[PDB]
Design a protein around this nucleic acid. Structure first.
Lengths: 120, 122, 56, 114, 209
RNA sequence: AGGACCGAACCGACUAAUGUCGAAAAAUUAGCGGAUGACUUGUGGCUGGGGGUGAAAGGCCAAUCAAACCGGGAGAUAGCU
RNA sequence: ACACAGGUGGUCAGGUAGAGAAUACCAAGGCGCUUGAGAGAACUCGGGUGAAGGAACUAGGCAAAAUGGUGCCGUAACUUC
RNA sequence: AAUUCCUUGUCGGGUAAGUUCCGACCUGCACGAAUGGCGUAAUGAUGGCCAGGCUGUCUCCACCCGAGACUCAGUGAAAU
RNA sequence: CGAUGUCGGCUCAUCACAUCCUGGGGCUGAAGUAGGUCCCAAGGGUAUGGCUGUUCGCCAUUUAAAGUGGUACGCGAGCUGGGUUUAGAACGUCGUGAGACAGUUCGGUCCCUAUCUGCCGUGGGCGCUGGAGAACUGAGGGGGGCUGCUCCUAGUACGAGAGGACCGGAGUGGACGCAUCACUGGUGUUCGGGUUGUCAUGCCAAUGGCACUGCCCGGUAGCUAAAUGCGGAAGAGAUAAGUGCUGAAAGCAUCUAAGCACGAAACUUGCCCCGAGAUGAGUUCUCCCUGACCCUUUAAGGGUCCUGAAGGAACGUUGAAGACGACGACGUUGAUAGGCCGGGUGUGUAAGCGCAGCGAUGCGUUGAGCUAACCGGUACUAAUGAACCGUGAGGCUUAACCU
């Protein structure tokens, strides 16, 4: 009855649920903005935010930890070098959620998740 | 918690080794026996010279419980096993004299004060 | 587990009572581009609250 | 909230010895005998410690004459009296439940003293 | 006798010097401000209407604030009525506090229980499960037979079957009050009152023996 | 050496659940029996309806078996509906 | 009868562990099974865990649980030895 | 007794309690010697009984992870 | 007989009273106690196991009692299939045989997505007559109603002794029911750690994937019981059996015909929940609305433009709320959710580095590192204004109050 319960299943078993966020987070970091379904977007907010908070500091331990999850040398180098200093001042809240339209083919409510900055 | 078909380790010099409960007394359809209750038992394993013999019916008081009891502060006392002390089926007095192992404080009734004196600990 | 006599077309219609869709009636016109976007939804071009939000 | 914690902090006795789950501890506890109030001793291994502030508690396993006896205690109760530690053991786990079935030989906890 | 409206804020245990751990709920009972008094003359019964808390000014609306305006009392979250016991008299604007309960020994708490939602009969009425195995097919927790046969040819009103469980107003009677704090606006009653932590409760003295 | 043992491929089909307008006009899942032999299997032949074959039930003979299927006598006869 | 969880003879068949064509993870190579998105009720199906007791359940230990390997030691009644 | 109607025969063992089970008696309703009789090691997805081990079978269910169920979008049956 | 489809058990029941227990009384060859018998009384309660397929029944042990029956010998579009009736097979008996049976013995397919009525829950529409926001009244309805034991009285009343109260008070329990996680525990495939096999990260190291969460040891919040609190009731009114009182018919007498007073878990309330769709549609408090006009059968009318309020809904963050609706909080004048900061809790001494050891490994830095839902703060991010719906003074008649 999920009283005071967190998380979302997203109609998947745990392992697949976890592994797709490992992929979705790195997909975000490399592109800084992605289009996805709204409930998936809200659950992504509890994943990338820890990483940007992990990149607000810097060490060898954090470099291994942010490599422990997310399993990518490219992303971890994209992290800890640009995204960290770019978000050095913000106290949390590094993502924006913009609700786009409706995915015609499953009628899913899609949305845009991007970084706050995205300065070009 | 002791119930029907529960094997009990004997805890006196009455002359048994293993006993099995059959019927928790005291009230219609009572399903459980705590540390200070009378149960009806049978004898399933006895020493060859004891006061009782294999295949009799009599009563006991379950003195040790793996579930244990709860003290009024919330503390519990959980033993390792389930032990009983045999009775006299009419007079409720214990058969054997020497009682092994510790007993709880809550057995302190006037009708079990004999057992309290014979126990070594607590 | 089946019917006994076929339901009348009248009884058929009454079951279709609560099936009409609800109209939107919430099309907020954007402040700058002026598109007919839904509330809390970006426009067709990617404007929201008077801002090129999508950068696309 | 602040309401419960204010109401709880004025109940915890502020003199707990910091023991560790795996240290042999003697616990002294009150016992009332109708009118006569007496003190009672208890010394075993601390196999489980639970922290909840006021509801913090600890369990002590003592092998009595023949068999083991396990007993928990409300740390902040007036029933406990003195929780004098006896020996700093060296164990890895936080709850020592394997001592429920490892008696005799394996029941030797390794003393720490570091 | 009249009562008050509190808010269930967790529960805990109070150790006595006798070593008796007494579990108690903590209820913050704020200043019950009497809004409006009804009478046998105007209405047909003598009772008062109270309020507690303070809603946001821009949130509280026109009719209710105008209702609060004639009473001249600061706004709270909703109202509650309390039947008088023929002889006690309080006027509009009087601030009833928790000091009323510093004489009583047993109270009654009216609360709104947790909502379990659509709960099965096993959880609702404690029906017995039918056998997990021994060939039992597709039927473990269903109720089973619900009628007799052709003689009644129907199902009697009041069959215990599945439905919405909880989320319904109940009342635990005769809870021993332990300690009545005024300065913290706290009330420590023995036991466990209904509702989740943070919900609102109607507390009143024990009408029962 | 074994109509030997344990056990995959292969073969068979004892127990239970699911299914029962099913995924399927007898299957799936979980465990089971045989598994160098009276074994199993690919290809091609020979035996036919009151007959064929049968480690024998009266089982199988193209989803059909107290007697196949197709056509004919035949619009059989029907004190019954 | 279908873009059907079934059936279909022969050859090839590597790396690590392993007795092994078992099994586990992978190579070569081939695929994600042709409706999805959310929700996280009752109840059903496939499973994981369990305080204390332990067949008291039931037609019946049905099902689950458990035992399970290698080396060495040791091994009864009975027997066609 | 795979056979025994009377019948759950009677006695003994097992059980706190045993219409089933094992041993025995003999009045074999209506066993019997290749329509084979009486035993028999081994063997058996064989019928019945008991014990240890082990457990959610049960006392009494409790919680959790997935597939449906439920809502939205597309397609769209059936017995009756 | 163009199908009402099964014996018993299981789950789940309801009603009757010819009453098993509890309650109230009468009489005795009822001393007391404890029983016997009869009358009144249906509210709640009314075993667990062994053998049998069994209903039944016998037995064991309890309990205050383990009541008799109706309900298609209740219940199989709810489960089971043991019994019993399918095709296999065997024993005995009967028959020449095919087969049969006052017979028993192993094995052996239990189909159905609910239209309607019904029932348990939950909403939409309109009405309630000016509309809207809340708080209650209370018709009526449902739930609930069991009791053991010990002590005080008292070892008193009574008794030949042995025994042994009533009545009233209090404590402590079994079953059941409601409620809640503070404690004791369960689970916790989103939290920490160990470890077997193997693949990849170019290697070692450190991690990650898969093998039922790979196998497991612990474990927060929730949910939850075996856990922890609470309840049955008293009392009131009118009564049954029954006890009476004062009293005629019938000078007496008589519980009764007049009248009058007691008298049960029974009955109507008291206690808790639902409840104004109770169309007889209630009451009180509060807020909002006081437009120009054409028109016709001058109608409680429609139409045109002007105004569209209180408030509501939608949308959005959401919730110890929830299947969907609905319901509760908030929507920047903002702490609703995420994130963040600190704390707590849980797991047990991270990684890297340095020393000793042949090495596995161990010690120091380090009660570290990492922490899911929990608690206190913080607008960093997302809840954008406004729009849409909702109107413009509330018919007629009569009467009483004021020009």
């Amino acid at each position: 009855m999920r009283h005071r319960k967190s998380g979302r299943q997203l109609n998947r078993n745990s392992s697949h649920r976890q592994a797709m966020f490992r992929n979705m987070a790195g997909s975000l970091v490399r592109h800084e903005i992605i289009k996805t379904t709204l409930p998936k977007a809200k659950e992504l907010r509890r994943v990338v935010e820890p990483l940007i908070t992990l990149a607000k500091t810097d060490s060898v331990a954090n470099r291994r930890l942010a490599f422990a999850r997310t399993r990518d040398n490219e992303i971890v180098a994209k992290l800890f070098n640009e995204l960290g200093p770019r978000f050095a001042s913000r106290a949390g809240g590094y993502t924006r959620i913009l609700k786009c339209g409706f995915r015609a083919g499953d009628n899913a409510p899609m949305a845009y998740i991007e970084l706050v900055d995205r300065s070009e | 918690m002791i119930q029907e078909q529960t094997m009990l380790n004997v805890a006196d010099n009455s002359g048994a080794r293993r006993v099995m409960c059959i019927k928790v007394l005291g009230g219609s359809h009572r399903r459980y026996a705590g540390v200070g209750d009378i149960i009806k038992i049978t004898i399933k394993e006895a020493i060859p010279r004891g006061k009782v013999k294999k295949g009799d019916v009599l009563k006991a008081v379950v003195v040790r419980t793996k579930k244990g009891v709860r003290r009024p502060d919330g503390s519990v006392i959980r033993f390792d096993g389930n032990a009983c002390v045999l009775l006299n089926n009419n007079s409720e007095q214990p058969i054997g004299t020497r009682i092994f192992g510790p007993v709880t404080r809550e057995l302190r009734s006037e009708k079990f004060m004999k057992i309290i004196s014979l126990a070594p600990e607590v | 587990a089946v019917q006994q006599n076929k339901p009348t077309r009248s009884k058929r219609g009454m079951r279709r009572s609560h099936d009409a869709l609800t109209a939107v009636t919430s099309l907020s016109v954007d402040k700058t581009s002026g598109e007919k976007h839904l509330r809390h939804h970006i426009t067709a071009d990617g404007y929201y609250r008077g801002r090129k939000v999508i950068a696309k | 909230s602040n309401i419960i914690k204010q109401l709880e902090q004025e109940q915890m006795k502020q003199d707990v010895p910091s023991f560790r789950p795996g240290d042999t501890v003697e616990v002294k506890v009150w016992v009332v005998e109708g009118s006569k109030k007496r003190l009672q001793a208890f010394e075993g291994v601390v196999i489980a410690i639970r922290n909840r502030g006021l509801h913090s508690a600890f369990t002590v396993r003592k092998i009595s004459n023949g068999e083991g006896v396990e007993r928990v205690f409300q740390t902040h109760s007036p029933v406990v009296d003195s929780i004098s530690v006896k020996r700093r053991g060296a164990v890895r786990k936080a709850k020592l439940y394997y001592l429920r079935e490892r008696t005799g030989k394996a029941a030797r906890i390794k003393e720490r003293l570091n | 006798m009249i009562g008050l409206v509190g808010k269930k804020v967790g529960m805990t245990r109070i150790f006595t010097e006798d070593g008796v751990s007494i579990p108690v709920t903590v209820i913050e009972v704020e200043a019950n401000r009497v809004t409006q008094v009804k009478d046998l003359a105007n209405d047909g019964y003598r009772a008062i209407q109270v309020t507690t808390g303070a809603k946001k000014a821009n949130r509280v609306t026109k009719p209710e604030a105008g209702h609060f305006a004639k009473a001249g009392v600061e706004a709270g979250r909703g109202l509650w009525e309390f039947r008088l016991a023929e002889g006690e008299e309080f006027t509009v604007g009087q601030s009833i506090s928790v000091e009323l309960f510093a004489d009583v020994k047993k109270v009654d708490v009216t609360g709104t229980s947790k909502g379990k939602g659509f709960a099965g009969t096993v959880k609702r009425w404690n029906f017995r499960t039918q056998d997990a195995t021994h060939g039992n097919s597709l039927s473990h927790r269903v109720p089973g037979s619900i009628g007799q046969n052709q003689t009644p040819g129907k199902v009697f009103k009041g069959k215990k079957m599945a439905g919405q469980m909880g989320n319904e107003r109940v009342t635990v009677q005769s809870l021993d009050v332990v300690r009545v704090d005024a300065e913290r606006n706290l009330l420590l009653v023995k036991g466990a009152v209904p509702g989740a932590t943070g919900s609102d409760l109607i507390v009143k003295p024990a009408v029962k023996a």
